[PDB]
Symmetry: D2
Subunit: 445 residues, 4 copies
Amino acid sequence: PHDPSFTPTQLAARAAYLLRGNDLGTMTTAAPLLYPHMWSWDAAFVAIGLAPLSVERAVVELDTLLSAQWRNGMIPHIVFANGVDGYFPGPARWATATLADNAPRNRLTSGITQPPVHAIAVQRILEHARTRGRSTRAVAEAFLDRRWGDLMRWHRWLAECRDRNERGRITLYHGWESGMANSPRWDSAYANVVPGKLPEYQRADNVIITDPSQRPSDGEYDRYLWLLEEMKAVRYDDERLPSVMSFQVEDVFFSAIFSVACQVLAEIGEDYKRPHADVKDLYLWAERFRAGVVETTDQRTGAARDFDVLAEKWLVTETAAQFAPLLCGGLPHDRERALLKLLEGPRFCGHPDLKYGLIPSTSPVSRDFRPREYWRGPVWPVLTWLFSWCFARRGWAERARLLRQEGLRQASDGSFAEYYEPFTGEPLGSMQQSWTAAAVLDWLG
Amino acid sequence: PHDPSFTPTQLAARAAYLLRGNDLGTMTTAAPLLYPHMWSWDAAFVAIGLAPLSVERAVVELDTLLSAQWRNGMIPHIVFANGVDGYFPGPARWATATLADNAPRNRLTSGITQPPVHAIAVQRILEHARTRGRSTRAVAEAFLDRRWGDLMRWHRWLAECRDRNERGRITLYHGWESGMANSPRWDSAYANVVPGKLPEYQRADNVIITDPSQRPSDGEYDRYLWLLEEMKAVRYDDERLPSVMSFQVEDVFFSAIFSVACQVLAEIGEDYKRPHADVKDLYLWAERFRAGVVETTDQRTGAARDFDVLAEKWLVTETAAQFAPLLCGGLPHDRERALLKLLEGPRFCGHPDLKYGLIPSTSPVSRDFRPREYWRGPVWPVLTWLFSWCFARRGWAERARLLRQEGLRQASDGSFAEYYEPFTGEPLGSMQQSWTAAAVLDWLG
Amino acid sequence: PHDPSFTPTQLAARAAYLLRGNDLGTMTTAAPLLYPHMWSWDAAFVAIGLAPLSVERAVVELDTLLSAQWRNGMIPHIVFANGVDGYFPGPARWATATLADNAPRNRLTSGITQPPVHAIAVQRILEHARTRGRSTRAVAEAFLDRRWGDLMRWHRWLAECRDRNERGRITLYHGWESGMANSPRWDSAYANVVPGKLPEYQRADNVIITDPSQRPSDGEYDRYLWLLEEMKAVRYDDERLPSVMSFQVEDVFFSAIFSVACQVLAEIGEDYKRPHADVKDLYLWAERFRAGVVETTDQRTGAARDFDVLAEKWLVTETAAQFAPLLCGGLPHDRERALLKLLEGPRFCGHPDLKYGLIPSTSPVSRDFRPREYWRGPVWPVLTWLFSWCFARRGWAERARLLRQEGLRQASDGSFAEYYEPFTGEPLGSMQQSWTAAAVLDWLG
Amino acid sequence: PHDPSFTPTQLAARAAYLLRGNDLGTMTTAAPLLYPHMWSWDAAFVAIGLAPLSVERAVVELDTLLSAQWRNGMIPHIVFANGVDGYFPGPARWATATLADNAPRNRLTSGITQPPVHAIAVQRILEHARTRGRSTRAVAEAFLDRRWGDLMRWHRWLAECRDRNERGRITLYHGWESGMANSPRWDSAYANVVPGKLPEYQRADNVIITDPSQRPSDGEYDRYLWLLEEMKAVRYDDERLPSVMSFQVEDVFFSAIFSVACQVLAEIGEDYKRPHADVKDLYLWAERFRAGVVETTDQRTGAARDFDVLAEKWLVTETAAQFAPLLCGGLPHDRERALLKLLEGPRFCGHPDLKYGLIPSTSPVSRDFRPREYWRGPVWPVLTWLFSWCFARRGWAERARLLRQEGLRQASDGSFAEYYEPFTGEPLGSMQQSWTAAAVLDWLG
Ligand SMILES: O=C(O)CO[C@H]1O[C@H](CO)[C@@H](O)[C@H](O)[C@H]1O
Ligand SMILES: O=C(O)CO[C@H]1O[C@H](CO)[C@@H](O)[C@H](O)[C@H]1O
Ligand SMILES: O=C(O)CO[C@H]1O[C@H](CO)[C@@H](O)[C@H](O)[C@H]1O
Ligand SMILES: O=C(O)CO[C@H]1O[C@H](CO)[C@@H](O)[C@H](O)[C@H]1O
């Protein structure tokens, strides 16, 4: 074993083998043990990974997620597998089945949301299906007939209920909704979250990942679970969250993803003759959230800032989320060049100690940087994929290719890790993470 | 869709996806519906297909098969999945659980055997494991410690009980044991099988494959099931089969496979310091069955003949089994050149109407040729793989490469069919056949 | 015998082998015999094909072409190789060395121009160089230092002498300047070219390509050569050509390429700190010619029209030049969607009889279509490459990938043909055409 | 900057680009500057590298080499290019044109020989040709018609003049004839070469490779050039060399290659109906030299020894030549297993400090090992290729695949180095070495 890496064909085979191994039947777990249920934006990436293998099964993945959509349009971030234990907080802790008027009737789910990457998976499914012939196109088109209305209600819930003041940015009531639990982005907002009488609990996550340097701290978990108590006390009522929640942030990365997803979904709606009023609403939201992202940006570097709604203060941190405007567009030409210089330079992809030319979750030169600790440093394959795909859509073919090339180099150990140590390449988090396999499958072609 | 073929990475991913989809837990079905249990030589090819994906799981496949080995050493050709229906004849029809003193205690199996390709899978597992590092080598070596004795008992049962007169050829008591149910090889022997009072039955196979041109006939099935009645009447007693069975043939292709497998297993035994008496016995059987194969051969073309033990007559047919001596070696140089000329010329791989340069199961110029009918014509990916691997082991690197190249071209539609129409390339038999996916995975590397 | 196609590695090897074989030392011929000299836009694509093999030799190709630049900035379309004949019209016929005040010294050239794809080649060279480390970057940067001013003069001459009315479109004085000698685009303009006493001549092109269905007619060559007589009579003076040329057309495809090239060169100028005044002029021209292209388009379909300056008439034809606006952008959203539908539908890439999903030079349903006859119908790999690269730069990643995939499929016979029959795939024109090899090399990566 | 390695397609392209760049027209130089002439066994490997690009040009390479064959059948090791200097000793130093009765007319050559790998190149050319269809087959068959007799005379001269005692081993009169100028194999024989008055000279090789650690010493060159004086003094007469040469050794590696080459050429002769008497002689020589190689081997390890004819002493050294019997076969089973264990163990491919699992020219644990110094330790791609091809011909498919994989990994920097430092992988010797490019081209397929 002078070189432990796999060839492209061995790697693609092992990624497909993994994805089928994590398939419970109609949903794919995000990982074998650490995340043994369906997560919302993981499910979108899993559908992308399944599209080269089975358009029918990729569609089933999104059908299963959309069957758990709330009555008001929200897609919740966890759809729990029936009778499966081992993730905390579990269905009993959320108590949405009893408390939440809008929760679905034949599914157990969480009570918060996650980024709307789902339209992007729909586009990848359609692109695959169109290369495969008439009966496969029929399958993808029947999915659109079945779920276009549900996708619209999802986008409409985000635009009307999480952007109540039409600022063009998505408000979050939990850091988990950003997809980045312990990102330095949320530290000053979480410092203003003071738990009251928090019901006793024991973590499950650090029983599986026992190295304490790779997961959040107990104090952070106390704050994560307290926010659940605040939502539960108002029975997850959208109208009441602004009045009671101790955590209210506008997430600029989520907002930029939503801008892209609206434009993607509008293009799908035009291609497939969906209602014109829907397409118009989608294009309107795409531009509003593009403008809302650009309004946050640093006047010199173009870097995007999150916003603390309770403190009424811009949140200035050095994480990958600063590059949100690169995803959706809209910066003045001059400022977008400066932002690309930031991305490629020694604070991020050009840092000289990096093993791969990839985007660390937090800049290695930030004092918040921790090379092992979840979203505080490590390189995440899922972010590499999203940036590469969005860059290709901006027309930046060579930038997209370079990220794909380094992403595949990093993944060629076959660990399919959740995230990787930025300097040594050590695989961290869960092994056999479904969306890492999915990124590899989509890249390999 | 100007071209429906998959790239090598898409094809490898789809083959791995298939193999995991056919995994019931500790055994892989030979196909989803037509063959919903474990078959013996399929299980060996499945282990070859799993070795690039998981050495641990490839080992489990062979452990599961060897746990169904009979007390006298026989590996039976079907290990039935618990509580699974849809294949006939099923466990009730065989009745080995009640009738057969040697049947295993916690497994339902058939009562006949199949070709000993298992040593070849063990070699592929070891070759993969040695590229993967210390803990993976440990897994493969623990399997050898656990099952070397069982593999020896398998080879010893074949050599002592199916070659009672030490002729160096394996006697079969059912055409199913050849792996080629309806091969023209067995027609004259089956014409001497006269069913008595055969208990009523309904076929299951042609409920799944309904095109009558792709499966054997009802009259052929009557003979297949009558031979079961003859074995059952003597309770599957090895000592009594020569006295009662209406079908007794020496199978030269099975014999040549056994010769190769003995030499492969002896080399493994030397590499891993197995008992010297075992290695010596294996080399002895390798040479005896090589000599027994060569003794059947046509003096002009080198083609190998099967032998009808009851009629005491050589069986002269034009099938791929004629090329048995190419697998094990031993022909005089002159005659092996003539046999290769036969293989490559217009009766087989060089026939001008073939879509791919592959070996049809029956020569297209034989009057027995039927282009759709199971073993009477179609091109079988499993045979392509076996010939290519044996050719590479003879040192015929370019011949092996050409078969691999045409095999991958044929499989690039992604149907993973059981067999293919030789002229049009139409996929036939079951789709999603496990050993076809396994061949592709092993070839792609 | 069963599959004449090459593997990607064999095809890449043969493409590089061809490019080196057509290298005369400091210039590469466009083909071995039909085009045994340097052609201007072929040299740009050749530099693109050389960049993965040797950045130094790619730079030499462009240095050689630019050493032949006219004193007013024009890049002539042929740079003749020393002492080579076999192409007509050759240097004696053009007589630029004796007649043209602006012709270079110590190079022999034609007296007309060709499309400005050169900036695209510079970008590909720079992209390759930045992946190769310090010494290779220095070679490419030194080329910029040495040739930026010549590239500016080339673009300035197009913008100021071939768009003297600031309409944002390039005027041509010969069909050869379009790169598409016999395109139906020019038929109505050539119909008004009436030759006088034309000095006699013998074609060389149809001594080499003898099939008369594949090349222009004698009548067409008479008009081609007559236009030369008109230019020669005014000593190729820019100020006098408007007064005397019988052929004056605005070429919308050339104009779109110029817009793209100006934008590409402007971004290079910013990245490498070229003078601000130059970058501002390049962005000004990029916008002007983008607008000039859009001004030609059909309001329903988006199809771009050429313009006959002498007849003052829009030239409405059904060729791939209609798709000019897709290259440079600028169409309203609805009109660009309509133009893409035209491109993908049954009149072009969707035509049911096409062997590959590629853009034919003329629509197969046009009365002007001739499937073998040069630019009147065949599929040209150079156009496939240019459309796929421009599409990727628009962000249309899947559209670009499909063109690349089909172009590679078409090229996989290894003929490296100049163009291909659109229905049968028969290779046509010259074999061993340098820019077809270059496209393959750039695509295969 | 993060990964200097090339993709397989880029590497294949660059290898072909190099081979065409070293083509002088009808001969290919072994390197651009260090070896600016045709070398005999390099030309064979070059023909192998050309065969995937152009069977016609591969045949031309061998035609050129054979047009330089001596009248007695010897193929000389250098064919000098017209009017090229820069290699010493050059044609003036050899003086074969004036002194050697058997030297060719209108070619300038050296006066010594080199290993007979040529038949292997003929087989690869034929294998490629048979995949390309009728006209390409005709080119390769016409080469056989034209050159079979010259190939027979080459083999007959080796068998009759360099094995005059029918011992089945080839006698050399210069270390250069082994292809391994400064191998430790020859140190004790060179220790008895005492030069007299040697006409003065200046090396050219170490003007080009200036690092003295990478080339032989001045003292060694004095002995090399003195042996020339001894040959010249008897006008290169075969009958007189035994009486006068101070260096006479039987080369067991050369002998094994000759055995393989005789067997390969015999099979070609049968396939293409060459005269029966020739094929019988080739099989006779194949067996004789197989036996002569085995006669040298250590009875415990199988390691093959060279033999010093003057000292009448077996030459016991630890170089890759010890593995000669693995190429040609003939060892008893137990002895060959022992020799493979030596090859794979810590003295060769298993040494823990090696960067790649490749065969070093001298064992790193030998007192004679020097990691930079030519044949005293470095890893040579040409040996990797020759071992992997011969291993595949033995049927050792996995052993051949591993050597090919590691050789491709080592070559993936694109230096195409003559040899590589075994521990660091630093490229050494000449860059752009033609037979390293040829090995890559043949491997990549
Ligand atoms: O949401 C949580 O409770 C834990 O979140 C982690 O696991 C999820 C599944 O992989 C992802 O969706 C998140 O992005 C990741 O940070
Ligand atoms: O044995 C049977 O009852 C039916 O046999 C067919 O199905 C089996 C599973 O694929 C194979 O093992 C045989 O080779 C094939 O002919
Ligand atoms: O027909 C001609 O005499 C020359 O024109 C052809 O050859 C040139 C070299 O390939 C190209 O530059 C043109 O695009 C192509 O049309
Ligand atoms: O050192 C020298 O003067 C010549 O010898 C070297 O160059 C030749 C061309 O590569 C090879 O034929 C030999 O194998 C190699 O040893």
